[PDB]
Amino acid sequence: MSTVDFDTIFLNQSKAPGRFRITSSGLGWKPSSQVPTKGKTDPFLLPSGDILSVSWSRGYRGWELRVYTRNDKVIMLDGFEQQDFQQLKNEIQRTFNVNLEHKEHSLRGWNWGKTQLTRAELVFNVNNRPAWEIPYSEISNSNLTGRHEISMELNPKTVDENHYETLGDELVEVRLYVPGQKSQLFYEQLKDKADFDTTSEAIVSFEDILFLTPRGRFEISMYANNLRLRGQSYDYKIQNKNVLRIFSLPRLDDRHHLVILQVDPPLRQGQTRYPFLVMQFDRNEELEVELNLSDEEYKSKYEGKLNRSYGTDSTYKILSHCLRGLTERRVITPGSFQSQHMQPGVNCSLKASEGQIYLLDKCLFFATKPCVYLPYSGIISVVTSRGSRTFDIEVQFSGGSHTFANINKDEQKPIEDFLKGQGVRVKNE
Amino acid sequence: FKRYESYVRESQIPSKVKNLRISIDPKAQTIILPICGRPVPFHINSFKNGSKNEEGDYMYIRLNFNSPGMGSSVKKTELPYEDGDDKEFVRSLTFRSTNKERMSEVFKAITELKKTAVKRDQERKTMEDVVAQAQLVEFKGRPK
C-alpha cells in the first residue's frame, strides 16, 4: 500500500512543521519532533468518510490544501510546493474519489466586491474571484454597528489545550459595509450559518435600559454563562466570569439609581474602551419578572441565589439581585459615609468632567465618564489643597495622582474623618 | 474610476511574505495582509487611514479602507472605487501582534507609502496643465 507523505507541512497555520500522510483510512498530520511545543504530541487524524471536497490554492508558505469536511469544518494544510500538485491530485482522486479543485484568488488590491455565505466559510469575491475566505468556526461574534455596517469579531487564538501555537499577525475584527435597502438580512443569514446563539433562551430579559456609558438604550438578556447587551447600533456578549464588580449607587438627585458593572476585558466600541458600564434607572420604575427556568434546574443550581418570581419591586433591585445570582459577584452598595447634607456621595469635578464621588467602605468610586475606581489598599496619601467656598482633593497612588476639584468646603471634615477611619494617610497642605 | 491593480500574477508576490505577517510592497504600492493563512493584497489607493493601539502584551493596528458614506475629500468626478449600488466594501480590518516595535514600524511605512502616493497624485494633477512645452529656444545672435 503506497503511503504518500509530505514533510514540512503546517496544520491550520501551526508554528511547528509536521509530516502529512495520505492513507486509505483518511488524512493524518503529526508535528515534527524537533520543536519543544508545550502541547499534546498526538497526531491529527481526519477519517476518509468526513472529506467532502478539496481545494488547492496559494497560501503564505507556498501552496495550501484546503479540505472541506461534511461537519462544516475547514482544515488548512500549507507548505506544499507547486510540483506536489500532480501527485496530490492523483492520490486524492485514487484514495477518496474527490476532485482536487484549483482555486485562483483575486490579487487586484480592491476592497470592494460581493460577499457570499458558503456552507462552511464566508467568501469575499473581487471581480468574480475569491479575495479571501473566513471559516465560520473562526468567527466568535457578529454585530450590526450601522444601518449598512456589519462587524465580525474573530476568536483571537491565545492558549487553548487543543490548538497548536499560531505564527504571525492575527486578524481580530472585520468590518463590512453592505449598501442598499440588505445588511440586516445578511446579518441574520450569517447568524444562522455560523451557528451562534440558539434563538434567545434568556433566563431573564430587561428591555429599554438607559446606559450613560456606552451612551445608548440596550436590552439586557441574561444567560447561565453570559450576559448579552442588544442595542440599535451594537450587540455585546459579556461572559459572567469577565464581570469583576457590581456597584449599586443612588444618584444625589434622589430621583435616579445607578447600576455600574466593571468588565475585564473592557468592552470596545470602535477605538474607545468601556471598562465600566453605567446604567441609569428611575427609582420609581417597578418591574415584575418571572425567571425562564424549569423547577428541577431552579432547585438544583439557583435555589437561595435567585428568586423564582420577583414581585413588583424597583427594576434596579431585581437587576442587581439577578446579576449577583448569575455572576456570583458581591453587589457593592453605599458605605457608612454620610455627607454634611446626609448624602451618600459628594459633587466634584475630575478635570473637565463634573460628577459624584462615593466613599465606599473599601474604595473611592467616581461615577461619571470617565469612571474611576480607587481601592484604599492602593492609595499612598490624600492631599487636600485650597483652590474659596470649595477645596480640591489629590489622591496619590502607585500609578499616578487624581485631582478632584470644586468640592464644597463643608464636606472637608466628614471626608477627612472617614478617610482617616479607613487607614488612609491624609495630608492637609 | 481610477483603475489601479496590485498584482496580475501570484509570482509577483514578494517571497519575504511567508511568516504570516503584515508586509508592505513599495514597488507595487500594496499592503499585504494575513487573512486566514492567505496573503491578501490591498492597493494604497483603497487604503484610507489607520490607527494603532497598545493593549497589554499585544499591539493592535486598525486599517480603514475607502467606502461610500464614509468617503474621502475627493470630488464626485474621480472615485477610488468603481460605482456600484450592489458592491459591498471591506471597511476596516483590525490585526494584533505580540511584537510592538515591528508593528509600529509597519504602521509608519504604510503611512509614508500613503503620503508618497498622495504627493505623486498632486504632482500629476498640477502637471496635467499645458506645462509640457518646447524648451526655451536660444537666440542665435546677440540677445537683448
Give the H/E segment covering residue B47. strand B47-55
* Alpha-carbon distance B40 to nearest alpha carbon in chain A (angstroms): 7
Q: What cell numbers appear for B143 in the block?
A: 540677445
Residue whose C-alpha is closest to residue A334's, from A365, A355, A293 = A365
State the amino acid at position A208 in one-letter form: D
Task: Tell me which chain B residues have a C-beta less than 8 angstroms from the C-beta of A133.
Answer: 36, 38
State the amino acid at position A172 in one-letter form: V
Cβ of A163 under 8 Å from any chain B Cβ?
A: no
* Alpha-carbon distance B77 to nearest alpha carbon in chain A (angstroms): 19
DSSP structural state of residue B49: E
The C-alpha cell 476639584 sits at: A405
Residue whose C-alpha is closest to residue A14's, from B39, B32, B37 = B37
Task: Tell me which chain B residues have a C-beta less than 8 angstroms from the C-beta of A13.
Answer: 20, 36-37
Contact B56, A264 (CB under 8 A): no
What gap in Å lies between CA B103 and CA B96, rounded to an integer? 9
Residue whose C-alpha is closest to residue A223's, from A155, A129, A291, A175 = A291
Residues 116-145 of A with CB under 8 A from B: 124, 131-135, 138
Contact A10, A17 (CB under 8 A): yes
Contact A44, A11 (CB under 8 A): yes
C-alpha neighbours within 13 Å on the C-beta side of residue B121: 14
- DSSP, collapsed to helix, strand or coil, labels residue B24 as strand
Residue whose C-alpha is closest to residue B4's, from B80, B109, B89 = B80
C-alpha neighbours within 13 Å on the C-beta side of residue A274: 21
State the amino acid at position A86 in one-letter form: Q
State the amino acid at position B119 in one-letter form: K
Say whether B95 and A64 touch across the interface (CB within 8 A): no
R_g of chain B, CA atoms, integer Å? 20
Tell me phi and psi for residue A219, to 5 degrees: -85, 130
In three state form, how does the secondary structure of chain A look? CCCEEEEEEEECCECCCEEEEEECCEEEEEECCCCCCCCCCCCEEEEHHHEEEEEEEECCCCEEEEEEECCCCEEEEEEECCCHHHHHHHHHHHHHCCCEEECCCCCCCCCEEEEEECCCEEEEEECCEEEEEEEHHHEEEEEEEECCEEEEEECCCCCCCCCCCECCCEEEEEEEECCCCCHHHHHHHHHHHCCCCCCCCCCEEEEEEEEEECEEEEEEEECCCEEEEEECCEEEEEEHHHEEEEEEEECCCCCEEEEEEEEEEEEEECCEEEEEEEEEEECCCEEEEECCCCHHHHHHHHCCCCCCEEEEEEHHHHHHHHHHHHHCCCEECCCCCCCCCCCCCEEEEECCEEEEEEEECCEEEECCCCCEEEEHHHEEEEEEEECCCEEEEEEEECCEEEEEEEEEHHHHHHHHHHHHHCCCCEEEC
CB neighbourhood size of A73 (10 A)? 15
DSSP structural state of residue B116: H
Contact A183, B108 (CB under 8 A): no
What gap in Å lies between CA A271 and CA A79, rounded to an integer? 36
DSSP B58-114: EEEEEEEE--SSS--S--TT--SS---TT-EEEEEEEEEES-HHHHHHHHHHHHHHH
Q: Mention every residue, 6+ apart, whose C-beta is less than 8 A from residue B102.
A: B21
Q: How many residues does chain B have?
A: 144
Test mutation, B30, B38, B102, chain A, max A CBs within 10 A = B38
The approach used to solve this structure was: cryo-EM
Say whether B68 and A113 touch across the interface (CB within 8 A): no
What gap in Å lies between CA A346 and CA A390, rounded to an integer? 12
Question: Which residues, in sequence order, are bridge partners of residue A134?
Answer: A122
Contact B23, B6 (CB under 8 A): no
Contact A408, A347 (CB under 8 A): yes
What gap in Å lies between CA B57 and CA B34, rounded to an integer? 20
State the amino acid at position B48 in one-letter form: K
Cis-peptide, bond into residue A214, ω within 30° of zero:
yes
Q: What cell numbers appear for A12 in the block?
A: 491550520
Question: Cα A327 to chain center, whole Å?
Answer: 16
Tell me phi and psi for residue B57, to 5 degrees: -80, -10
Q: Measuring CA to CA, how many Å separate B104 from each of B59, B65, B101?
A: 8, 19, 5
Q: What cell numbers appear for A317 in the block?
A: 433591585
What gap in Å lies between CA A267 and CA B109, rounded to an integer? 30
How are beta strands A243-250 and A331-332 bridged, if at all? parallel
What gap in Å lies between CA A104 and CA B94, rounded to an integer? 25
Q: Could you give the strand order of the β-sheet that contains B23-25, starting from the edge strand earlier in sequence?
A: B23-25, B30-35, B38-43
Cis-peptide, bond into residue A334, ω within 30° of zero:
no
Cβ of B2 under 8 Å from any chain A Cβ?
A: no
CB neighbourhood size of A383 (10 A)? 16
Q: What cell numbers appear for A400 in the block?
A: 499616578
Say whether B96 and A174 touch across the interface (CB within 8 A): no
Q: What cell numbers appear for B24 in the block?
A: 508592505
DSSP structural state of residue B12: G
Q: Mention every residue, 6+ apart, whose C-beta is less than 8 A from residue A220.
A: A205, A206, A209, A227, A228, A229, A319
Cβ of A293 under 8 Å from any chain B Cβ?
A: no
Cβ pairs A/B, distance under 8 A: 165
What gap in Å lies between CA A267 and CA A276, rounded to an integer? 8
Residue whose C-alpha is closest to residue B41's, from A123, A105, A138, A116 = A105
The C-alpha cell 417597578 sits at: A286
The C-alpha cell 469544518 sits at: A73
Q: What angle do CA B136, B138, B140 make, to 5 degrees?
A: 160
What gap in Å lies between CA A315 and CA A258, rounded to an integer? 11
In three state form, how does the secondary structure of A309-339 look? EEEEEEHHHHHHHHHHHHHCCCEECCCCCCC
Q: CB burial class (10 A; 0-12, 13-18, 19+) of residue B33?
A: buried
Cβ of B7 under 8 Å from any chain A Cβ?
A: yes
Question: Which residues, in sequence order, are bridge partners of residue A261?
Answer: A246, A277
Q: What cell numbers appear for B56 in the block?
A: 497589554
What gap in Å lies between CA A228 and CA A216, rounded to an integer? 15
Q: What cell numbers appear for A330 in the block?
A: 458581591
Say whether B94 and A173 touch across the interface (CB within 8 A): yes
Cβ of B16 under 8 Å from any chain A Cβ?
A: no
Question: Among partner residues A12, A107, A173, which is closest to B41 by beta-carbon distance?
Answer: A107
Give the H/E segment covering residue B54. strand B47-55
Say whether A174 and B93 touch across the interface (CB within 8 A): yes
Residue whose C-alpha is closest to residue A6's, from A62, A69, A68, A53 = A62
Say whether B41 and A179 touch across the interface (CB within 8 A): no
Q: What angle do CA A51, A52, A56 make, to 5 degrees?
A: 90
